[PDB]
Ligand SMILES: Nc1cc(Br)ccn1
Ligand SMILES: Nc1cc(Br)ccn1
């Protein structure tokens with residue numbers, strides 16, 4: 374079954390177990406393999422994998438990681454993925470002193486949005502967008518990955534799992550524990566990610582839910598009904614040069630992504646027009 | 661607002677329509693099953709309705725389950741004594757897909773009265789996944805309904821309830837309802853309910869969205885008008901039972917129109 378794959382090295386661990394880089398002995402294709410242990414006497418195939426696999430089989434966009442195969446055994450499941458050099462977080466870290474050029478930022482954000490818009494157009498929420506889950510190659514691409522915390526939504530949305538999105542990237546309507554959330558939460562995350570590519574530090578690095586709330590308020594302005602109609606009624610509500618290097622258009626897009634009100638928060642579709650991406654190119658990254 | 665994904669509501673509808681064809685069961689599958697029948701499938705679906713109420717599952721979970729079953733029996737000969745094993749495994753799969761807090765496997769074994777072992781359930785799980793090639797994201801009657809509800813004005817509790825009742829009654833009878841697409845059944849269920857509680861038809865705004873007229877929806881509306889009329893005489897009662905409760909505003913207690 375995996376007779377044709379040769380293990381090269383471990384590249385990370387996720388919900389499931391271990392992700393490895395491997396090579397197809399017969400084709401030379403370098404791949405990433407995700408080993409998922411099956412609970413054959415207890416809880417069977419994890420729902421994480423049921424969602425990841427079923428949703429990735431539908432999404433075939435140049436900015437969504439490609440699942441090339443699913444190799445079954447009695448006891449193990451291997452997901453075969455296309456290999457991407459690294460994740461945005463490692464790249465950011467590599468670039469903390471040099472910086473990431475503005476053209477490449479622009480390109481990465483453009484792609485991320487094209488990817489994400491495809492998700493939304495196909496009733497899928499990602500719900501875990503953070504730099505560690507975004508993969509880049511050496512030819513200047515970026516792609517959404519790790520769709521284990523993803524959900525196929527209905528219209529209108531109903532109540533989904535609340536424990537969603539790493540704290541730092543978690544939108545205010547999840548924090549405050551609102552009953553319903555939707556495609557807006559992914560945009561928030563991307564907005565947090567835009568900011569991070571520009572500064573190479575995270576925008577809202579909280580130690581707790583309460584700290585996270587305070588971190589947002591002080592930056593975007595204590596939300597009020599005039600800015601976020603409803604903020605005061607939200608279940609857990611209670612009594613600039615954010616990015617120096619960034620142009621006038623940049624700052625406009627960012628605010629629209631980081632809007633408090635999920636209804637007023639820009640869609641991925643809208644954002645793909647924002648003047649910021651009028652001169653977008655596809656630079657190669659320095660790595 | 662954003663909970664109705666305004667900038668995507670259309671692309672999503674179009675996608676679901678394209679996908680409801682790909683996830684469509686074989687209309688003739690039961691005549692090619694040497695050992696099982698439409699009637700046995702009736703018992704199976706009826707039993708799944710009951711399980712969804714004891715475990716308080718989403719109705720959407722029930723629809724997926726039935727999709728999983730029809731696609732599985734569209735590809736695999738199954739003997740009667742295993743028909744329940746397939747259905748239990750589908751419900752389990754639909755729960756893992758759709759529910760925030762799915763029942764554990766042990767509860768899926770408990771409901772079969774230990775007709776089957778845990779190993780069998782879990783093995784059948786894997787087989788169902790392989791046969792469906794992990795395509796679990798099937799559009800359902802409900803996914804069309806919840807969209808079709810947003811074209812009411814005002815919103816109506818009883819019409820929404822009543823539409824779901826009819827939708828679920830369709831899941832029980834392969835004949836005729838396998839030869840209709842979910843989007844269609846959904847539309848036929850919406851009209852019938854609107855009329856019954858208000859006197860109003862399939863609205864115009866939905867005709868523009870779907871390309872479906874009352875004329876094109878007549879066959880299904882007929883079959884379904886019958887089902888509603890014969891509902892108290894149907895050998896399977898679990899849905900009626902279920903919709904006689906406040907949660908669904910006893911829409912099962914309502915007398916259907918005449919024509
Ligand atoms: N059997 C295997 C497993 C991995 Br991981 C890589 C190659 N072969
Ligand atoms: N390096 C990687 C990891 C995954 Br998961 C997918 C693609 N490339």
Ligand SMILES: Nc1cc(Br)ccn1
Nearest residue numbers: 703704707743744775
């Ligand atoms: N033995 C059985 C099988 C089903 Br399906 C429902 C009830 N009892």
